[PDB]
Coordinates of C-alpha atoms in Angstrom, one line a residue:
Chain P
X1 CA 116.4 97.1 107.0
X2 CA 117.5 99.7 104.4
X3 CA 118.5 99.2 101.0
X4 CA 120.8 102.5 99.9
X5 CA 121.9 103.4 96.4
X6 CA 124.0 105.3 94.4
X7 CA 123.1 108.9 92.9
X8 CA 121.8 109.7 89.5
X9 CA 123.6 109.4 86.6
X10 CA 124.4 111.0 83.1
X11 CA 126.4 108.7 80.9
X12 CA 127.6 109.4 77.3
X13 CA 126.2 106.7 74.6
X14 CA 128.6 103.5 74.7
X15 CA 130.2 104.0 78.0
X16 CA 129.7 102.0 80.8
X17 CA 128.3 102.6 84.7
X18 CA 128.2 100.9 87.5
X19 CA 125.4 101.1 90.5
X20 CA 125.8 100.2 94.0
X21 CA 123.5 98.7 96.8
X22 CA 124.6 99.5 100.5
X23 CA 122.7 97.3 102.5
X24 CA 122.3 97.1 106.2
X25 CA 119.9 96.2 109.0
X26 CA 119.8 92.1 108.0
X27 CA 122.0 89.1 107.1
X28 CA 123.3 90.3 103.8
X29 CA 123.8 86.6 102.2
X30 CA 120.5 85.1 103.9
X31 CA 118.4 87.0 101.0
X32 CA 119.0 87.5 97.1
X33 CA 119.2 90.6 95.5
X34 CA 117.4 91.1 92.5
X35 CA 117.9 94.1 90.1
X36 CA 115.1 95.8 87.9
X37 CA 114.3 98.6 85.7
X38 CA 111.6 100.7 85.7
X39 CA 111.2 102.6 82.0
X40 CA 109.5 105.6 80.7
X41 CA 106.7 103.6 80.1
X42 CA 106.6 102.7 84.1
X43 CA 107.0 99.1 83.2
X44 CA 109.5 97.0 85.1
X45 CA 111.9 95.1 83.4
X46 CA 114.1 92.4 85.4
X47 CA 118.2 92.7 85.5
X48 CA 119.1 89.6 87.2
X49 CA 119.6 88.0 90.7
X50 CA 122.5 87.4 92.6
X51 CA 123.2 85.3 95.6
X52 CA 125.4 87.0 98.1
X53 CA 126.2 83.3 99.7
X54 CA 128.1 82.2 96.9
X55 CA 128.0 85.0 94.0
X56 CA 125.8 82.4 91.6
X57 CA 123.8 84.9 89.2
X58 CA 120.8 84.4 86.8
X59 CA 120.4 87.3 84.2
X60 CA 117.7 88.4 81.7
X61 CA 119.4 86.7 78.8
X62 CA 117.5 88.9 76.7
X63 CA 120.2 91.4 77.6
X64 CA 122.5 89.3 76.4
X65 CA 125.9 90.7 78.1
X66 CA 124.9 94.2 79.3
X67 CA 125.2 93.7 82.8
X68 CA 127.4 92.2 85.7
X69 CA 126.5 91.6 89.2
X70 CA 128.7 91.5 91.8
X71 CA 128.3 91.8 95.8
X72 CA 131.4 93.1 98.4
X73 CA 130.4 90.8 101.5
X74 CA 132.6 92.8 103.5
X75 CA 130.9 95.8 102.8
X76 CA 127.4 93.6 102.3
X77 CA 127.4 96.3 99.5
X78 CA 125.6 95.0 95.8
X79 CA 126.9 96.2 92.3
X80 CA 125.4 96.2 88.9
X81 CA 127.9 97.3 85.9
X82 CA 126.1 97.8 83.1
X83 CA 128.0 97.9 79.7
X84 CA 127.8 99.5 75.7
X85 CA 124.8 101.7 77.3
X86 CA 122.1 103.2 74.8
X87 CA 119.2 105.9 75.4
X88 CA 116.8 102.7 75.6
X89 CA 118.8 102.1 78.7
X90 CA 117.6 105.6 80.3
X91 CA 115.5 104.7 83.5
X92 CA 115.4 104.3 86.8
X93 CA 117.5 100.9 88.5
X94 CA 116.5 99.4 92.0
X95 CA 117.9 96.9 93.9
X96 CA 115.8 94.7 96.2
X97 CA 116.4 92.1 98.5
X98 CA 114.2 89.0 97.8
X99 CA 113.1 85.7 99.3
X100 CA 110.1 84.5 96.8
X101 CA 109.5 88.6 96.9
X102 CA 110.6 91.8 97.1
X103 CA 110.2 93.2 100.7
X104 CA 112.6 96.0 100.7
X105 CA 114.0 98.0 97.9
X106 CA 116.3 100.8 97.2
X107 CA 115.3 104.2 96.7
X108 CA 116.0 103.9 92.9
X109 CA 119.0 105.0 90.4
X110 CA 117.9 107.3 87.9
X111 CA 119.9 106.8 84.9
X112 CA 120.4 108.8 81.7
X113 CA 122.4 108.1 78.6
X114 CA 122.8 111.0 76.2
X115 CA 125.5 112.5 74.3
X116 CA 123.5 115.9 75.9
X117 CA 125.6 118.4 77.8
X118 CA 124.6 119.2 81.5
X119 CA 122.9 122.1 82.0
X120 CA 121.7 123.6 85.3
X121 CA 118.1 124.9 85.8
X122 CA 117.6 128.9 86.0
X123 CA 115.1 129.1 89.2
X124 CA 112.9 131.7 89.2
X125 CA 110.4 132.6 92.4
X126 CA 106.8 133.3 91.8
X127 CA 105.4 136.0 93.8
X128 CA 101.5 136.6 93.6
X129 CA 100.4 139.8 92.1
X130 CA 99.9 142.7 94.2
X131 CA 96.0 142.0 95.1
X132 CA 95.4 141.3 98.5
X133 CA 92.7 138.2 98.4
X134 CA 93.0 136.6 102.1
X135 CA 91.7 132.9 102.2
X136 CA 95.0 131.3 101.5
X137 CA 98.3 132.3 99.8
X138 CA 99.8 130.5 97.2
X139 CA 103.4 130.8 96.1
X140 CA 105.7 128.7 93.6
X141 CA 108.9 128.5 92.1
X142 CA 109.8 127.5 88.4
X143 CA 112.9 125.5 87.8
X144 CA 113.4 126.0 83.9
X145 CA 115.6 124.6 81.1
X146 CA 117.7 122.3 83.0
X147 CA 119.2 118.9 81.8
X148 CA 119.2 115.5 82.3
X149 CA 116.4 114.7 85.3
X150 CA 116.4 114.5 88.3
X151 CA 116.3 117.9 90.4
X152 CA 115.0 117.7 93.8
X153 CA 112.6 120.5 95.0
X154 CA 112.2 121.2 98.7
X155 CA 110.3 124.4 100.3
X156 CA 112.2 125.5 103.4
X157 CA 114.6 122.8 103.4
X158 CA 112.1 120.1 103.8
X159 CA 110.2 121.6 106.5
X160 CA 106.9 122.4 104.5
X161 CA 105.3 119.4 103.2
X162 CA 101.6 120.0 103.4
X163 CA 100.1 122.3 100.7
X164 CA 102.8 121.6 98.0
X165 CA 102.4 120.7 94.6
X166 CA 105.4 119.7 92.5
X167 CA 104.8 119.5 89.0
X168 CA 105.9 116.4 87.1
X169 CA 109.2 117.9 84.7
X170 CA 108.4 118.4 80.9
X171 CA 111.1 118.0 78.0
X172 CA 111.0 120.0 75.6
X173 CA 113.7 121.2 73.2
X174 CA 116.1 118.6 74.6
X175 CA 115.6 120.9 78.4
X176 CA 113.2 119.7 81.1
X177 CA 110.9 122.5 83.0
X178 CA 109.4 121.9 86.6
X179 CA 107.5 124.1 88.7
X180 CA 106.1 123.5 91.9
X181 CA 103.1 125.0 94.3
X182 CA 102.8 126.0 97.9
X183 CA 100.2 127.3 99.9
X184 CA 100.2 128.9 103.3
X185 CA 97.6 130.7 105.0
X186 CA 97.2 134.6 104.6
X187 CA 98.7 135.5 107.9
X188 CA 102.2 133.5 107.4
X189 CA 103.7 134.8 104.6
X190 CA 105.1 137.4 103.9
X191 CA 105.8 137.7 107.4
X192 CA 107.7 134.0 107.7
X193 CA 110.0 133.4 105.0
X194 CA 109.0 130.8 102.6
X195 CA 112.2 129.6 100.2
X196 CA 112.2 126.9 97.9
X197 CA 115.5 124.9 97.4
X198 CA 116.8 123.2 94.2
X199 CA 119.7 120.6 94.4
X200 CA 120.7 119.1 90.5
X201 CA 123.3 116.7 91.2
X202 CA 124.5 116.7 87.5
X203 CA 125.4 119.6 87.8
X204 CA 126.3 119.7 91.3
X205 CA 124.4 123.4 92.3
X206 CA 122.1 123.5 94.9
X207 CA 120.2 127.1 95.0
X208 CA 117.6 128.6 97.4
X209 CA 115.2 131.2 96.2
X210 CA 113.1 132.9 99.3
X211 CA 109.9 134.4 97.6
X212 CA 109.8 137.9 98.6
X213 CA 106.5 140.0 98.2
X214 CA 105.5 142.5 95.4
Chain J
X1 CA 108.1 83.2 81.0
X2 CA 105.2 82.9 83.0
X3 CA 102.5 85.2 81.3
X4 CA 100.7 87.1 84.2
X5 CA 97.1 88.7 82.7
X6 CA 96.3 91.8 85.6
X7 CA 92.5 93.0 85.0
X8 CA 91.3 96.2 85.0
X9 CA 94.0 98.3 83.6
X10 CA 92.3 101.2 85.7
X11 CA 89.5 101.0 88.4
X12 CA 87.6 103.8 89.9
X13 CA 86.3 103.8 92.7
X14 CA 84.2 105.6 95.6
X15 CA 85.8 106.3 99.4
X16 CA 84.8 103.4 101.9
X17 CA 84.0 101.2 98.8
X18 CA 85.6 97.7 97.7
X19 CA 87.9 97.3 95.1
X20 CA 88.8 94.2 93.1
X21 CA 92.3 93.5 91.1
X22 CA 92.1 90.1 89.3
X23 CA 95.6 88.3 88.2
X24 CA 95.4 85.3 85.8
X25 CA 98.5 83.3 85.3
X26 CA 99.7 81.2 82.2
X27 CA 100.0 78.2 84.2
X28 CA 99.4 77.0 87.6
X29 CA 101.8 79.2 90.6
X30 CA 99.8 77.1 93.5
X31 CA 100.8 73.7 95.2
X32 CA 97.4 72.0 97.4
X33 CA 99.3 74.0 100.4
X34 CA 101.3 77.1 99.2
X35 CA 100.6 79.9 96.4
X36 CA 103.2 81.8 94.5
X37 CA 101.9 85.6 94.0
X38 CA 103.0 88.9 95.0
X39 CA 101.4 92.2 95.3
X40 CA 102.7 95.7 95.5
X41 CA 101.5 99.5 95.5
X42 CA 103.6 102.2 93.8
X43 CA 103.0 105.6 94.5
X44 CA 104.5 108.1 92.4
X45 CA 108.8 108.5 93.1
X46 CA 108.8 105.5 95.5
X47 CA 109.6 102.3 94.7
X48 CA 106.6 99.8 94.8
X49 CA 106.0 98.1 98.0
X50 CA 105.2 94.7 99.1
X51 CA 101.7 94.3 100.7
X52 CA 101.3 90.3 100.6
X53 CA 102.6 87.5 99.5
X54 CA 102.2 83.6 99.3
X55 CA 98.9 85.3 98.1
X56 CA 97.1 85.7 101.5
X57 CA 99.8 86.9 103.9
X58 CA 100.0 90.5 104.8
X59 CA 103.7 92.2 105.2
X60 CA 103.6 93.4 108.9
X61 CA 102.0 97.0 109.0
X62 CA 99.9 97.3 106.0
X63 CA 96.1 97.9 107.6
X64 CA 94.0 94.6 107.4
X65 CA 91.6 96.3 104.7
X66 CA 94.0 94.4 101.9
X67 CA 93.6 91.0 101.7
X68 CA 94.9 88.5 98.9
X69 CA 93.3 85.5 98.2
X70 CA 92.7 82.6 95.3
X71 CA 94.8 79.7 93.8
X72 CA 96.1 77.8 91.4
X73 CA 96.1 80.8 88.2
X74 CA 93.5 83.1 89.8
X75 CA 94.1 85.8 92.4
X76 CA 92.6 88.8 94.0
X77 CA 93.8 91.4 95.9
X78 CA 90.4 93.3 97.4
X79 CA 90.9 96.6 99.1
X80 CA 87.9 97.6 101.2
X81 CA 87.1 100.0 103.4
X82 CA 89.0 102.1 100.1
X83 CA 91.2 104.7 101.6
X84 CA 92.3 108.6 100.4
X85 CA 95.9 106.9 100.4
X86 CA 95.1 103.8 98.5
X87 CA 95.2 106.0 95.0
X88 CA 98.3 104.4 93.4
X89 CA 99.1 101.7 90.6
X90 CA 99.1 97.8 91.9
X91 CA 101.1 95.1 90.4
X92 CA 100.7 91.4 90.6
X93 CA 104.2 88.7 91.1
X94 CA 104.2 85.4 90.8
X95 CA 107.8 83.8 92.7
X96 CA 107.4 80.2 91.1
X97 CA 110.3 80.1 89.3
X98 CA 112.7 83.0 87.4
X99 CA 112.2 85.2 86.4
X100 CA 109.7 86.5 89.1
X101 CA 107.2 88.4 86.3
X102 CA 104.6 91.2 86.7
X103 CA 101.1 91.9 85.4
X104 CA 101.1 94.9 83.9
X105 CA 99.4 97.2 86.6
X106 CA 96.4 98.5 87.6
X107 CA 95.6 102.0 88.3
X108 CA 93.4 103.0 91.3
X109 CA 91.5 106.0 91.6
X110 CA 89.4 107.5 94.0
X111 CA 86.1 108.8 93.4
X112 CA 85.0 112.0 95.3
X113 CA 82.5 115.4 95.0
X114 CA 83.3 117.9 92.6
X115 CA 85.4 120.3 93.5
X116 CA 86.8 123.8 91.3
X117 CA 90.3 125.0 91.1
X118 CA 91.9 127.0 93.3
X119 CA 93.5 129.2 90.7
X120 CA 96.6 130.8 90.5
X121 CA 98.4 133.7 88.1
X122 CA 102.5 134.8 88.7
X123 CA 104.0 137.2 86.6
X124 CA 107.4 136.9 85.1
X125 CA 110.4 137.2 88.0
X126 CA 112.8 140.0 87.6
X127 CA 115.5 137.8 87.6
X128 CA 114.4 136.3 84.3
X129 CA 113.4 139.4 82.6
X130 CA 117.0 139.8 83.2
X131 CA 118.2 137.2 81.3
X132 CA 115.8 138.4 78.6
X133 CA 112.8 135.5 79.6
X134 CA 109.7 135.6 80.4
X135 CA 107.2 133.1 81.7
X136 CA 104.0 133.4 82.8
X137 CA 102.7 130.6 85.5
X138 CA 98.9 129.8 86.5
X139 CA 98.2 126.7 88.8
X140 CA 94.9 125.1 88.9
X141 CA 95.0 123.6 92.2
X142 CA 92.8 120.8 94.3
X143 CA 90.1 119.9 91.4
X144 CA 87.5 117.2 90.6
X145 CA 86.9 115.5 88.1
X146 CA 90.4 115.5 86.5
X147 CA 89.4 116.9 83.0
X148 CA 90.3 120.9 82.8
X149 CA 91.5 122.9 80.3
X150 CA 93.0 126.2 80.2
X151 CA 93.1 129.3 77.9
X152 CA 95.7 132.0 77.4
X153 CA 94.4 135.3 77.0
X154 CA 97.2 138.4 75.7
X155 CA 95.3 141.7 75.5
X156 CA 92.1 139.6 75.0
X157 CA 93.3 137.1 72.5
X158 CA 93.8 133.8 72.6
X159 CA 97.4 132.6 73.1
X160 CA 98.3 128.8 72.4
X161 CA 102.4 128.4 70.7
X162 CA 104.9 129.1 73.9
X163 CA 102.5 126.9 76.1
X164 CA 103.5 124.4 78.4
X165 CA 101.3 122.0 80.6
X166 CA 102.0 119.5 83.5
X167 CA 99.6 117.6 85.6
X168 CA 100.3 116.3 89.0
X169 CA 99.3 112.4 89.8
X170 CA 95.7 112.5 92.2
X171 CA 96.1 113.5 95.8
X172 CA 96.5 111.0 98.2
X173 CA 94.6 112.9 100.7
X174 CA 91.9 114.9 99.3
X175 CA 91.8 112.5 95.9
X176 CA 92.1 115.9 94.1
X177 CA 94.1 117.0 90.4
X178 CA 96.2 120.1 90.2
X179 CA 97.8 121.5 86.8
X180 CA 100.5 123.5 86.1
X181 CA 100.4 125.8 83.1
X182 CA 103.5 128.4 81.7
X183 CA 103.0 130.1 78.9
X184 CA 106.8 131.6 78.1
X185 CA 107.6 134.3 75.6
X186 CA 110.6 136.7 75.3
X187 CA 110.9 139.8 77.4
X188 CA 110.5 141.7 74.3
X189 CA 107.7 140.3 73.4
X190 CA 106.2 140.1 76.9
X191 CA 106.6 144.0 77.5
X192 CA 104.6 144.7 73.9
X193 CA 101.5 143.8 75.8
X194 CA 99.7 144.8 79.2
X195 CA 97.0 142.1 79.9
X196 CA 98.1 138.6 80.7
X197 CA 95.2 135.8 81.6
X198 CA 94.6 132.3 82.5
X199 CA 91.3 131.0 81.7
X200 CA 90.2 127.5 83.6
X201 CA 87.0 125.9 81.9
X202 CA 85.7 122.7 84.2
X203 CA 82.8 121.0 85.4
X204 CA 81.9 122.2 88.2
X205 CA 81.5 126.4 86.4
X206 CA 79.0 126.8 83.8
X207 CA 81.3 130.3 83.2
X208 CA 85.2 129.8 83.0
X209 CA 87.6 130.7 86.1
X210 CA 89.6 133.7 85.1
X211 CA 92.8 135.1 86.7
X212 CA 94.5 138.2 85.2
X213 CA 96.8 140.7 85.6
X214 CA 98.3 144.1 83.7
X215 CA 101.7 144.3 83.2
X216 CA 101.5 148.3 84.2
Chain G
X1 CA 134.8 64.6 90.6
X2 CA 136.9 64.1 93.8
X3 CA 133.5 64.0 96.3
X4 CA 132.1 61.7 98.5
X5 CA 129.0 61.2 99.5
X6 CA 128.2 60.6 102.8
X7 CA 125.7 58.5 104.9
X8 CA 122.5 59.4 105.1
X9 CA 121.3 61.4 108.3
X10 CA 119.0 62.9 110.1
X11 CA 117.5 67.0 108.4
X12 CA 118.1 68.9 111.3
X13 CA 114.6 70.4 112.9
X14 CA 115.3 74.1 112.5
X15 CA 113.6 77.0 114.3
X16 CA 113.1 79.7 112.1
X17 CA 111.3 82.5 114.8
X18 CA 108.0 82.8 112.9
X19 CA 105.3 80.2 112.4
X20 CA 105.7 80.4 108.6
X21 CA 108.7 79.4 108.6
X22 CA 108.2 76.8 110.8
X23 CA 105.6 75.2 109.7
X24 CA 107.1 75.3 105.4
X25 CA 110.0 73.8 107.0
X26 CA 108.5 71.0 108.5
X27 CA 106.2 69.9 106.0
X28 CA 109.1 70.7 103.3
X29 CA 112.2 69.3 104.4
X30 CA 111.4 65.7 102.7
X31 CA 112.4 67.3 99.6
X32 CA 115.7 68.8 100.6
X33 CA 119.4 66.5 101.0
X34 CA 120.2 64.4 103.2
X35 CA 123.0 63.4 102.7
X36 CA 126.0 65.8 101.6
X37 CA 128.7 65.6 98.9
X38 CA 132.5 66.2 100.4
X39 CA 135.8 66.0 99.6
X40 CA 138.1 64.6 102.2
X41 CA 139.2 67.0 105.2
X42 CA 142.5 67.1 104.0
X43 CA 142.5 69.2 100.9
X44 CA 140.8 72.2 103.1
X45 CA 142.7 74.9 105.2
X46 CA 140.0 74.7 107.5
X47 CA 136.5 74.0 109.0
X48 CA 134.9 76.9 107.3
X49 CA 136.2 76.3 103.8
X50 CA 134.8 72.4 103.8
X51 CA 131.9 73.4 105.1
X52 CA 130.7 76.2 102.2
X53 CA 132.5 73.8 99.7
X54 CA 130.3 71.1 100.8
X55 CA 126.6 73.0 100.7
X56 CA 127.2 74.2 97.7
X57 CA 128.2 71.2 96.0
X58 CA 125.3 69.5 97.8
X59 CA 122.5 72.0 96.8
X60 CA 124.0 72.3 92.9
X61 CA 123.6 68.4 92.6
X62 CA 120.6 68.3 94.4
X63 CA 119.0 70.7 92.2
X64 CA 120.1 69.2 89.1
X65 CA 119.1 65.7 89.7
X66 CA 115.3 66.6 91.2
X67 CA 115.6 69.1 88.2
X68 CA 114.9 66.1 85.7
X69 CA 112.3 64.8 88.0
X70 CA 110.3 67.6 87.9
X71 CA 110.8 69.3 90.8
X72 CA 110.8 72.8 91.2
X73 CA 112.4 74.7 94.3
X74 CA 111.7 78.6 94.9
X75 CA 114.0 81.1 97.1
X76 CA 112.8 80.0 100.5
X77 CA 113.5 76.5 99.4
X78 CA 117.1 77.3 98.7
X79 CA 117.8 79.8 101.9
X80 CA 116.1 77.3 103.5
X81 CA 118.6 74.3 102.3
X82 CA 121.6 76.5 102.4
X83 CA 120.7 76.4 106.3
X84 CA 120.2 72.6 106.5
X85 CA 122.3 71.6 104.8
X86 CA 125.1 74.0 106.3
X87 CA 124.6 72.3 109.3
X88 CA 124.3 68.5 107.9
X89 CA 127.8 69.8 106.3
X90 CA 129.6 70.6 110.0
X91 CA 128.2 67.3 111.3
X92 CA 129.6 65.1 108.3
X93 CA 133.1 67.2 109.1
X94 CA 132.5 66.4 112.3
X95 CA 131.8 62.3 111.8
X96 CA 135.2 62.9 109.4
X97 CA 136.4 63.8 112.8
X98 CA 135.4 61.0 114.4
X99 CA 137.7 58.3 111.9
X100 CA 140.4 59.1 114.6

């Protein structure tokens, strides 16, 4: 079962989007498909449901008419449209299939709406400073003044999981800042190459920065 | 709406230990034979997952130390033995009717021994002296208890304007912290001075952790 | 509004592959239809259109008359009626069939 969404968004104040739900793996109209909201604050905040079956939907009425489900049975594909979007609508969107619960959701849509401009993060590597202390080595990359969220940080292509630290993004100045932390033992680096990878699908620029001694 | 009331709002709690998350619901979510409740685990960038529902019934592969139980408008979900990767924030469903609401959460945390930073200090690259930058990075890595705090230092004095801070979620194997700290000035400014430090004050060092470097 | 409503019958026993299932269904499946609304054979192009007509007729008018008694049906409830009654729907096609 797999539940498959698509990519982040920037959308200007007062235009409209619309999110889809690949799903495969199970009978596509023997399960509803709810859609929620997760804000800034990390609280969830339900859509609506729709029944691939027969297309009946319940909404959050609160919403009032800011959003319209769909589902493609021949492509067992779900849309949400959502319309007249404001910066209270910035978050991240999941679909999930449901039978009295949510068993399997989608990976999550992160949304933002802001009359912003794109900008693409400057990446800088972090080398240590040349003082040879041998327990570990720790190396890092900064990913600076970059807008809207999200970037996705990878050392060596995905390759090195264990010993990394990626730092939650900060705004500031209407431009987010990440960083993130690896650590390898003395004896790898700098004889391995160790490169950390940036994709920002806003902007679409994917860079790779190998952190090179001195 | 069915009002769901989720108790604690955070829980602490030691490895191998039990812990307790209560939901109260505004009206009955049980018949005599079936009950209506839900409960997930979100760890940070993932999208919460389903550990039981009909209150008792665990999803096929979570480990038998959850367990759901209660009726009618009170339900548990107890966790014991506590795991490393159990640190993450838990949220209570009912499914009686629409819309399918939440308690607000509850955050689990794992206790664990002290333990200091691992500390960290990176000079400005050269490709952003380039463009005229300059940021100075120091990572407090791996540390317990949570509360830190760190000190600029410029030739000696305290730095705090150009400062900025971010602190990663707790570890889900070693139930460690880690922080991030970049203090960023211009290139100009950065090459008036020759002494740049990162002082980390914590628990576990009567003395601060320092980490320096000269720009010479 | 152009429907029949057909004889009683018999709920199908369905076997859902997991006890669960199985056992909600059975001690459940007094509260679903049985009996199905219809329109006649004759204004359908074919087996497949009376059929989803027909549950979802059914299952609307079931839910709005055991609405005002109080009843309350979940999810499983409905996946599990759209399935019932799908195949209560085929047989009343099929005793339609059986006129000639």
């Amino acid at each position: 079962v797999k539940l498959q969404e698509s990519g982040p968004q920037l959308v200007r104040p007062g235009s409209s989007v619309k999110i889809s739900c690949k799903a495969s793996g199970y009978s596509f109209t023997g399960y509803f498909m709810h859609w929620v909201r997760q804000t800034r604050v990390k609280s969830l905040e339900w859509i609506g449901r729709i029944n691939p079956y027969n297309g009946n939907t319940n909404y959050n009425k609160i919403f009032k008419k800011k959003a319209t489900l769909t589902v493609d049975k021949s492509s067992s594909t779900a849309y949400m449209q959502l319309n007249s979007l404001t910066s209270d609508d910035s978050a991240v969107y999941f679909c999930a299939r449901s039978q009295d619960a949510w068993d399997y959701w989608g990976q999550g849509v992160t949304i933002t709406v802001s009359s912003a401009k794109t900008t693409p993060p400057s990446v800088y590597p972090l080398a240590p400073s040349a003082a040879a202390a041998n327990s570990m080595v720790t190396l890092g990359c900064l990913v600076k003044g970059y807008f809207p969220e999200p970037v996705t940080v990878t050392w060596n292509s995905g390759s090195l999981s264990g010993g990394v630290h990626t730092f939650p993004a900060v705004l500031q100045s209407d431009l987010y800042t990440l960083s993130s932390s690896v650590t390898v033992p003395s004896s790898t680096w700098p004889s391995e190459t160790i490169t950390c990878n940036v994709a920002h699908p806003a902007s679409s620029t994917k860079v790779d920065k190998k952190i090179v001694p001195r | 709406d069915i009002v769901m009331t989720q108790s604690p709002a955070v829980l602490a709690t030691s490895n191998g230990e039990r812990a307790t998350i209560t939901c109260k619901a505004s009206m009955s979510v049980s018949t005599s034979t079936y009950s209506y409740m839900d409960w997930y685990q979100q760890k940070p960038g993932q999208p919460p997952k389903l550990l039981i529902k009909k209150a008792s019934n665990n999803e096929t592969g979570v480990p038998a130390r959850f367990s759901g139980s209660g009726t009618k408008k009170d339900f548990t979900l107890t966790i014991h033995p506590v795991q490393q990767e159990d640190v993450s924030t838990y949220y209570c469903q009912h499914s009686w009717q629409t819309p399918l609401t939440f308690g607000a959460g509850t955050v689990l945390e794992l206790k664990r021994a002290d333990a200091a930073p691992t500390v960290s200090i990176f000079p400005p690259s050269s490709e952003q002296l380039t463009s005229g930058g300059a940021s100075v990075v120091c990572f407090l890595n791996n540390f317990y208890p949570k509360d830190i705090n760190v000190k600029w230092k410029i030739d000696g004095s305290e730095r705090q304007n150009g400062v900025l801070n971010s602190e990663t979620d707790q570890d889900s194997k070693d139930s460690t912290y880690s922080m991030s700290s970049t203090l960023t000035l211009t290139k100009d400014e950065y090459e008036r001075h020759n002494s740049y430090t990162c002082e980390a004050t914590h628990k576990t060092s009567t003395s601060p952790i320092v980490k320096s470097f000269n720009r010479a | 509004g152009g429907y029949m409503l057909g004889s009683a019958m018999s709920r199908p026993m369905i076997h859902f592959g997991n006890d669960w299932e199985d056992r909600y269904y059975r001690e459940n499946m007094y509260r679903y239809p049985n009996q199905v609304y219809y329109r006649p054979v004759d204004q359908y192009s074919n087996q497949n259109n009376f059929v989803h007509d027909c549950v979802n007729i059914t299952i609307k008018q079931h839910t709005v008359t055991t609405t005002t008694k109080g009843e309350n049906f979940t999810e499983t409830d409905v996946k599990m009626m759209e399935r019932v009654v799908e195949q209560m729907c085929v047989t009343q096609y099929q005793k339609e069939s059986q006129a000639y």
